Symmetry: D2
Subunit: 190 residues, 4 copies
């Protein structure tokens, strides 16, 4: 057969290595089409059966969703960046939609923290680069950590964040089913 996997850029390089390793070890005859789009497009890709399985950081509402990894989410800035207390937090964000864009704005609002969109771009590479160059502050899971970056946390004025879930998602409505369930009886243990 031909297994098509959809993964967000975010979960593509963090948790797809471990999955894609296991896919090509138990079913070694099977061709692998890994399609990477933004995290927003992942629902439409699984609904329209463009992909057989999905690895996302945004829980869907209509599809069974197995959790592969839960990461703490951190505020990030450049290692030598200066977070100016008093002015709005200068945010470096994706354009609409990334739940993370939606999520970080909600979190700073619920803490009465002014913010600003210092840099909006359409891809993670543009966002990652802008934080590292120190154009402002962003939020991603703990796996984005490089020596380029520093964590901004409560003492710098930034509120706690929800966890990141890296979710394998499957549509109940044959090769999608067996691979999901092979990851599910191999996830807990045994």
């Amino acid at each position: 057969g031909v297994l098509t996997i959809g993964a967000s850029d975010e979960s593509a390089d963090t948790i797809l290595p471990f999955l894609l390793n296991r896919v090509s070890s138990v079913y070694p005859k099977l061709a692998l089409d890994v399609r990477v789009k933004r995290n927003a497009y992942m629902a439409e890709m699984l609904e329209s059966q463009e992909v057989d399985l999905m690895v996302t950081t945004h829980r869907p509402s209509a599809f069974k969703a197995l959790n592969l990894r839960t990461s703490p989410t951190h505020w990030y800035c450049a290692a030598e960046y200066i977070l100016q207390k008093g002015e709005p937090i200068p945010l470096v964000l994706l354009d609409d939609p990334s739940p993370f864009r939606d999520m970080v704005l909600a979190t700073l609002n619920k803490a009465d923290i002014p913010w600003r969109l210092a840099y909006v771009a359409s891809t993670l590479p543009a966002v990652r680069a802008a934080v590292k160059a120190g154009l402002g502050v962003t939020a991603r899971p703990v796996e984005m950590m490089s020596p380029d970056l520093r964590v901004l946390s409560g003492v710098d004025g930034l509120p706690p964040l929800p966890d990141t879930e890296y979710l394998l998602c499957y549509d109940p409505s044959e090769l999608a089913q067996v691979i999901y369930q092979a990851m599910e009886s191999y996830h807990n243990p045994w």
Copy 2:
């Protein structure tokens, strides 16, 4: 409103350096950084879609300032087993990528048997397959993570050309942002 195009490769490696300097010396100026695949960089700078370009493929018709020279290495999974004797299983982009063109030529010019074990459309798809131990690729030395192991001559792979990180400009436009920023980044690498 300076629009900078950067290859998927060179986006996080060499654009932090540039994007830092533009938004510090000319801190007023809005930034549209559009990042596409490595091949589309040539087309984008001529068609005036971008003001500037940062790629690892030297163009022939554009000014090209070299921002960094890194060695290119073969990579496989840290725990990968490369079976010497049977064909080199490549993890590559689909056409086009100069890295693909360079890898096949370097394997062809040294008469090494190979195969496409995995052809992908994006770097995140390629990296995942290398790290999962689906085959080998060649990328600049900046991709080295603990997931990966370096293949060198010892394992049967010939040396690879350097990776050049290029800031590129089209002189045939009226773009002051392009020209003065290209000359400004020339005032740092070699004033």
Copy 3:
């Protein structure tokens, strides 16, 4: 123009000593730098005996001035594909005493009635990280240890939160070393406007 002796613990030598040594050897380009790197516990003794003029540690002293250079979150780590069986005592990878992180991880887990066992005790950090990555157990370290070999354990895995780790530049006020104080006075004027 003198020879500045800086003491750093294994952890804060790697994380923030590049940042420190960069700032020192740009304002005083003539000044020689002797950095002696030991465990985190020997750091208090070293500054009082003026074996070093200044110290960078993650354990706040009781007797010394302390400039805060970075406050990082502290996280539990295990190997990326490690399996934490809920129900068995947590197998810990630790240093022997003394190490602040040990005292914290033991105090942390005791403070919330979670059983543990010493799956691996090591003598040095390179041994500890190697043991965490080998999937021999759990640890707690600042977020700066995070590599792809590893996975972070949080609340959903049954582990309590951790107090932050502070990377502190310290000075002996019971001293006469213009070197220590004036270099100390340089580091807060770049970490704060």
Copy 4:
């Protein structure tokens, strides 16, 4: 019983995750204390039988030595470090002994390149920290590469460097049956 492995500070965290991982899956039956000392002191530890195995990047003369990893060795400096042309190359090195210091000076003499010791340190973390702080140049295996750093190659005028071998080391003239059984386990599992 108790398996004592010595690792260099260098190779302790690079390739010892794999070995100590493999020891504890085939023999979860034995306790193991890994003590990491400087890269030179590894040999004396195995001859004086303080440790049963060694993992080093400096080949010893008296002991069995399994090749576990051959990775390219590179010049490093700070990502934005500025290497002047003719002026002598300012080196960031350990003080004697680290064979790496011996190797950097040996190869820089084979091509007649002027140098100077801009920064000598006591520990690997102090040397790497000075390289990252951008006080000069060092040469370390490709596993040191982080975004802090840039690689110096031929383009900038520094000569080529030899590979690094991460070697599992054992003394055959000592009858540690546990040492050899772990050596052959890493030898029958480094070759499938």
